[PDB]
């Protein structure tokens, strides 16, 4: 299990203050959202199990990512100075930090990765004692965060407060935070060729694997695989298709690999 | 549970 905090800080050249869309993703489920353009200017709950948290917690979180919003404003200014970019550009600071836990709730591995304008600006390694870098601006951020040992404080957060809140959400979300349908639909394409689409629905998390195996041989040719598309209510969707000649429907099957499946189902329509 | 720490770039 893991808790991801994705931060987006797209600046606006004179259209107002930088947008600070910030979200919380414990496992593959969003539970808290912060929108700098939202009317409430508050921590809108995004999960049925986080609406039970106390108003003190909500005030703490909303003050915290208001502070993070102004932090991203200042960081945008500093980076625009670093990259020597003009203020007329809509620059983005996208920040993700998070912490991994085992089934026992014990901390496994912490994440803190930063990206400016798409490129991976700076990230926290697996040790959680030092940072990575990509360019000279990332070198300046490296020097600043190693002079004040920002890595130590970030690691403290990740293996302290991060995992504490994560496991608290676990007791909050036993029924939700912790099974693809696999319809195996077919649609004719041509008298000599056809495509088979096995329709996996409502599986959580998104670590699905579809391979389109034929009882021993691996196929990646003509097996186009779409990205892990969520359905909207926290689950995800996945499917794949194979270009095959018509009339051999029984010869091709897809194998499903999901955490929620007791056994990997295989359909042979 | 959100990071109270804000390290600056």
């Amino acid at each position, epitope marked *: 299990h893991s808790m991801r905090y994705f931060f987006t800080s797209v600046s606006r050249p004179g259209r107002g203050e930088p947008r600070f869309i910030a979200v919380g993703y414990v496992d593959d489920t969003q539970f808290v959202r912060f929108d700098s353009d939202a009317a409430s200017q508050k921590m809108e709950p995004r999960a049925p199990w986080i609406e039970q948290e106390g108003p*003190e917690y909500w*005030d*703490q979180e909303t*003050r*915290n990512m*208001k*502070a993070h919003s*102004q*932090t991203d404003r*200042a960081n945008l200014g500093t980076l625009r100075g670093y990259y020597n970019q003009s203020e007329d550009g809509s620059h983005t600071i996208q920040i993700m930090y998070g912490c991994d836990v085992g089934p026992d709730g014990r901390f496994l591995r912490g994440y803190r990765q930063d990206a400016y304008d798409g490129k991976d600006y700076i990230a926290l390694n697996e040790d959680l004692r030092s940072w990575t870098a990509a360019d000279m601006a990332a070198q300046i951020t490296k020097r600043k965060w190693e002079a*004040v*040992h*920002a890595a*130590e*404080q970030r*690691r*403290v*957060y990740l293996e*302290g*407060r991060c995992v*504490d809140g994560l496991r608290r959400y676990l007791e909050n979300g036993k029924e939700t935070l912790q099974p693809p349908k696999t319809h195996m639909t077919h649609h004719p394409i041509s008298d000599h060729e056809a495509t088979l689409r096995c329709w996996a629905l409502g599986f959580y998390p998104a670590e699905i694997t579809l391979t389109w195996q034929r009882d021993g041989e691996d196929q990646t040719q003509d097996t186009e695989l779409v990205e892990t598309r969520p359905a909207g209510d926290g689950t995800f969707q996945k499917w794949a298709a194979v270009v095959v000649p018509s009339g051999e429907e029984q010869r091709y099957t897809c194998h499903v690999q999901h955490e929620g499946l007791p056994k990997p189902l295989t359909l042979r329509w | *549970f959100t*990071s*109270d*720490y*804000y*390290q*600056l770039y």
Partner: T-cell receptor
Amino acid sequence: GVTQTPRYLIKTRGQQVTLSCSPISGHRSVSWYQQTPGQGLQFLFEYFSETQRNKGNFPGRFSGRQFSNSRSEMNVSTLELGDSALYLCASSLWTGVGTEAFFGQGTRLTVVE
Amino acid sequence: QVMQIPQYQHVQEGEDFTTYCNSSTTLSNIQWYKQRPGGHPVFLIQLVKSGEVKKQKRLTFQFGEAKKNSSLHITATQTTDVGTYFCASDREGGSEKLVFGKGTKLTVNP
């Protein structure tokens, strides 16, 4: 390097009493502290960019504000005898955890009868 | 909530002003304030969770190489060392910014 005024204001009970703090140049977070000898450093309220981010356990009569230049002022209305404390300003370069909260010289308020 | 165990510690100008700052809820930083009597708490240094010890002047700071621990040591105390040494803890998750230990009134004998 925090300049804080007034130094030894002596306004009596009631009154308004405004205490001004000028944080270190570049510090955008200001924290307010009351040094009652019977309770030590008590957190009043913290200001970061014109907003009360963190507030301590004090009545509504303890109010403050922060200006555009990150300078902060506090107001202590309807004073009683228990407010004769050295009020302190803690200037953090940034709000939240992980910032060296430097301290101003203090405002030794006394609520004379 | 931090517990600075030596509420007051009257020593002589010889040595030994260990002011161990017991705490739970592992501290991101501790910081240390030397409140000169009749004065403001002067910031000494912030002990980020790098563990180890820091040797500012003749004082010896010590942040525990583990969760939720800290300390401080003047070694050779002197007259100018008199003051209420204060803990702090930003302690990610706390509504109050810095939770202070109740201080350690250090007095020395020439």
